[PDB]
Amino acid sequence: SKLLMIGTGPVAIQLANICYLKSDYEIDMVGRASTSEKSKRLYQAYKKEKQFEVKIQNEAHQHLEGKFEINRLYKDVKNVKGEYETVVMACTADAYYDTLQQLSLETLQSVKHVILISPTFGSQMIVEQFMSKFSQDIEVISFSTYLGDTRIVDKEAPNHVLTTGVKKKLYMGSTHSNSTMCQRISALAEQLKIQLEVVESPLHAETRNSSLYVHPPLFMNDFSLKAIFEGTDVPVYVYKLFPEGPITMTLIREMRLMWKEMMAILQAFRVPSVNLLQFMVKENYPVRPETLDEGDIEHFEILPDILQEYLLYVRYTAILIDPFSQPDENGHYFDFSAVPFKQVYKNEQDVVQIPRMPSEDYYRTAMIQHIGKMLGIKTPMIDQFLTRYEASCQAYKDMHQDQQLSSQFNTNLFEGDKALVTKFLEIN
Template sequence: MRKELKVPFRLNRDSEFIMILGNTLVVGAGPAGIQTSQILAPFSQKIALISKSSHQWENRKRLMRQHGNVASCEVSKPQLAPLVGLIRFDELYTDLSPLPSSWDTLVLATPAHAYCDVLASFSELCLKNLKQIILMSSMIGGCLILKGILKKKKVSPNIILFSSYFATSHFSSNPTTQHPLTVTTKTVKKRVYIYLSEPNDVLFNALRNALEKVNVQVVLFDNPFSVEGRNAAAYVHPAFLINTFSLDHILSNEDDTKYMYKLYPEGPITMELIKELLHHWKSISRLLEHYSAEPINLLQLLNDENLPVLEATIPKDKIDSFNELNEIEQEYLLYVRYSTILIDPNPFSESNTKKSTFEVSAKPYLKGKIRKGRLQLPRTPLEDLQTLYWLNHLVQQSSLVSSISFQSIEVFESWVKERNLPTTLIQALKQRASEYYVHATPSISQ
């Protein structure tokens, strides 16, 4: 039995929510995995953390074991206080096999493209015992793949899907001696979306109550595509990261810093790029509609999930009616939005130490390289490319083939050819997309 530590919102023993998750295994030992564990621990009989073997994981595991398997969660704002607390893990594991098979809940706090590998590593008995799998951040079509894998294995746990991780968290650069492994959560999203493959009011209410304590609104959908389509990165990353400007900078050896969300020449954003963003949004919207999902209002999602702009800049009625506006006005509003978030909203603040919200745009690109004859890209945009190739494969196998195109794939492949770069990555992306489709086929043909 896990020794109980004082957590601000831990529920009383006679609460209906206590232990509803049973034995919980969290896969992914990054900041999101640890903060998520802190939220789920009150609902778990015991909780364990696992990650693939790496220098970072061995170091984190060592720090926690020196302090009784404990990690600390802190916040940067008083209103996020319910996320503060200690989490004591009953076990810390490396790699997925062999493992005890007595898990009731599996939490995947890993990138979505790791889901297949994670499930493949579990024994049939372990999967058979699972009552629920919680996906903290899927990709579009990710639930389709997962359901197909589980159907082939003849298991049917409840799938709980989040549109995205609910916060922005990072490992503290100034941990204390008492708590050397500390995760700090800086911000939370205004709203997240959830899908459950089987209705479970008790579980949904437990998750909703925990997040609403930090003012994260939780919205339930009955279609996984409706949830997966409500992640802003699915729209913004392909347009802003998979273009000639961005790709050249990612691979360059230049010392100058460029930023992913700034206007040209500091970043990639031009009117032409805004057009590509709109085109990608409309392609994804057609795909969502094909799977009976509700398309999104792009401007509203950006305003909800990221930094909202002042109403004096973009009136609420313009945001609410964005889908009905003509294309020129849509382009204009998106360009205004990305221009506005470059401006310090409080330039005369007396505090020089307080970070301004406009710094949301100051995210530099991560760098890639050519190594041993292979093109190696950073996680962003590599994962975005993999998602695009998967969606493109899904489209090619459906009646949508004539109505949807993903321009970012054409841009990427042309860039590789024009720069005379190795093509092995393109082949690997296509192969992985094909594997995804094979996994998903049982659930597609239902």
């Protein structure tokens, strides 16, 4: 009953409050002041108040709120010592390996369960294969996504967070069928009034994340890459139609193609296919009954290619506005699609960063590409996505030689992660 929570962002804090209130674990958290001004402000803020706080916006989510203290906030990963039964990874998926590899042998030998909160497709494999050198029977659990939306209102008080939304449905799988830890997590979800479908494997759960299929076409195209890396004459928007945004028949086709390459990969692992339209429409953002035929939603996976694309395009067009918002007196609804692209930006030490979109999708897609090679499945759409992103990175370096740039601009990243997946797939 010690828990190590890797991450100090909003997600980590929400999760830490849940553990504090609903579990018997003594909770230690770990940041990275050694490489992050964000982490250092969190550490400094917690040191001062000796409290974290979760607020909510909608009283529907009361049970998530609270003020709490933890046992120990570690300033950096390398400081971690001792034994922990359970490790929770509330960092971004690209840091799982790099973070675990900094823990001590003593810590790593003690671990029974690693719980991955926002893994990509392939994360459990990386983490299981890694932890295997230290443990004979490591249990790894993957969720589909984090449970909701949590943020910091005020950058200067990053120990106070606000959960604004909770997802309707989440998925979870374990390396160990119907384990004690699965059942405890299931009982916890019930207590939190969150629906949780237990699926056969972590990989099954990792594939129930709409972002895997959608972010790459949306962000790794010429229109978007320009908006993020170079800028635009007038503001453009992620979810709008060309020329206001990237959405085009071309983009929708690239999405279908990527989805099918992913469905081929999933057939190899014998994981069920994902009805991308049903997911979008019944689990994410609803549309009016008049917009899409219920038969077309249900049968999406077996409909002709051109029809799958038409339905995706139509879906995106239907959420240009929030059709369930209150129209004003001129018949105008809330501009739900007016989401700006975040541009490349200088941190407070003048180092250029690439924003989460598409930083993190480069990692996800790079891993999907690598699984693909190892299984002998072709992924020409994936490949092109990655090529475009690499081009934009190289173009930025050539164009901004007087600028200090983060390691995100380098090639070829993720060698350790790739080696572990390679090894895991030789063994099964």
